[PDB]
Amino acid sequence: ALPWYRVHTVVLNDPGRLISVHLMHTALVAGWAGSMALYELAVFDPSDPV
Amino acid sequence: AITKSELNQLSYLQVKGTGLANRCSEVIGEDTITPKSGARLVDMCIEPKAWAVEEEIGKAGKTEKKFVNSKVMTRQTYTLEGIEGSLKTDGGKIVF
Numbered sequence: 250a251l252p253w254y255r256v257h258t259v260v261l262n263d264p265g266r267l268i269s270v271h272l273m274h275t276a277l278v279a280g281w282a283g284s285m286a287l288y289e290l291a292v293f294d295p296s297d298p299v
Numbered sequence: 300a301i302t303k304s305e306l307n308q309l310s311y312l313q314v315k316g317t318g319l320a321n322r323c324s325e326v327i328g329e330d331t332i333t334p335k336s337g338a339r340l341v342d343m344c345i346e347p348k349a350w351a352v353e354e355e356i357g358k359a360g361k362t363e364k365k366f367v368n369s370k371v372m373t374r375q376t377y378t379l380e381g382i383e384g385s386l387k388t389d390g391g392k393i394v395f
């Protein structure tokens with residue numbers, strides 16, 4: 250019944266699953282930070298800091 | 300243990316595994332010798348205790364050739380032992 254731009258409104262009146270979805274955004278953000286740091290550390294040249 | 304005289308007072312069984320076999324001995328005194336004629340240095344032991352490699356480093360907006368410290372990747376297998384030579388006097392100086 251819902252269109253494609255209203256799908257994520259099923260947790261509007263569900264306090265238990267709002268916490269879950271906000272936790273999911275949190276986990277994705279933390280994973281991105283960790284993986285980006287790991288990828289950056291493998292292409293960095295620390296020989297000349299000048 | 301620390302000197303050769305009391306190192307010769309130990310077994311191979313009670314020295315094996317401890318790491319003392321890679322150590323150099325220590326002397327005790329302040330006398331003079333003056334080698335006779337036809338003498339030979341024998342039993343010489345050389346033990347390194349610090350290693351460095353020359354390379355480029357940067358302090359503050361500058362670079363200079365500096366010796367940087369390094370860590371040995373192998374184990375206690377780096378001391379020379381049993382070196383022998385023949386002493387002589389050229390003009391008042393000793394040559395090995």
Ligand code: CLA
Nearest residue numbers: 263264265266267268269270271272273274275276278279
């Ligand atoms: C008095 C205690 C208390 C505490 C400490 C918090 C703390 C928090 N609440 Mg909150 N909340 C409270 C009472 C409290 N609230 C009450 C009374 C209500 C009404 C029911 C809510 C309703 C509420 C909602 C609806 C939401 C929050 C969310 C959050 C978190 C947002 C920041 C975040 O995700 O950090 C990032 C998290 C960390 C860095 C992790 C920190 C370590 C955690 C806390 C260890 C968890 C162990 C513990 C047993 C879990 C239960 C404790 C829980 C109460 C925190 C934050 C940890 C949001 C959330 O969960 O988003 C994810 C959210 O959406 N709260």
Ligand code: CLA
Nearest residue numbers: 254256257258270273274275276277278279280281282285
């Ligand atoms: C302050 C920081 C911040 C804020 C406010 C948000 C807010 C949001 N993030 Mg998130 N995110 C952040 C940091 C943040 N993020 C970081 C640091 C990362 C790691 C890189 C992510 C990774 C991330 C993922 C992986 C996902 C989100 C999603 C979401 C949205 C979920 C709510 C929703 O349904 O919106 C409804 C959606 C909209 C209103 C659309 C917003 C469109 C944005 C603002 C611009 C579009 C980007 C770009 C122009 C592409 C358009 C082209 C396209 C047509 C092809 C919400 C807008 C989810 C999402 O958007 O899925 C729907 C999702 O899947 N985030």
Ligand SMILES: CCCCCCCCCCCCCCCC(=O)OC[C@H](CO[C@H]1O[C@H](CS(=O)(=O)O)[C@@H](O)[C@H](O)[C@H]1O)OC(=O)CCCCCCCCCCCCCCC
Nearest residue numbers: 277278279280281282283284285286287288289290291292
């Ligand atoms: C899980 C991670 C989440 C995000 C975390 C942060 C990002 C992690 C790193 C991602 C890097 C991907 C881009 C690399 C940069 C680039 O494009 O330019 C660098 C090179 C330049 O090309 C070529 O050119 C260069 C010069 S030459 O070829 O030698 O002449 C050469 O150096 C290079 O090797 C060669 O490829 O690009 C590529 O050839 C790499 C191809 C892509 C590498 C694999 C991507 C893996 C994606 C799979 C998962 C998809 C996920 C989809 C959604 C779920």
Ligand SMILES: CCCCCCCCCCCCCCCC(=O)OC[C@H](COP(=O)(O)OC[C@@H](O)CO)OC(=O)CCCCCCCCCCCCCCC
Nearest residue numbers: 250251252253254255256257258259273274277278280281
């Ligand atoms: C891992 C992630 C991979 C996926 C990432 C993101 C995927 C998201 C893609 C979704 C975008 C799709 C939107 C289409 C969906 C679509 O358009 O549906 C049209 C939709 C119809 O609305 P209704 O409420 O009638 O919806 C009926 C429902 O059945 C639809 O769900 O209207 C809108 O969405 C309003 C916005 C106007 C949109 C106008 C679009 C035309 C733009 C111009 C086209 C180009 C012109 C070119 C010539 C110049």
Ligand SMILES: CC1=C(/C=C/C(C)=C/C=C/C(C)=C/C=C/C=C(C)/C=C/C=C(C)/C=C/C2=C(C)CCCC2(C)C)C(C)(C)CCC1
Nearest residue numbers: 273274275276277278279280281282283284285286287288
């Ligand atoms: C489970 C588990 C685990 C694991 C974990 C992991 C493995 C994780 C990972 C994670 C990860 C690895 C994550 C990642 C993430 C990422 C992200 C999230 C991304 C995003 C992106 C985006 C969003 C982008 C977009 C864009 C584009 C594409 C283009 C341009 C524009 C933009 C930027 C917007 C462990 C063992 C620890 C523990 C137990 C449990």
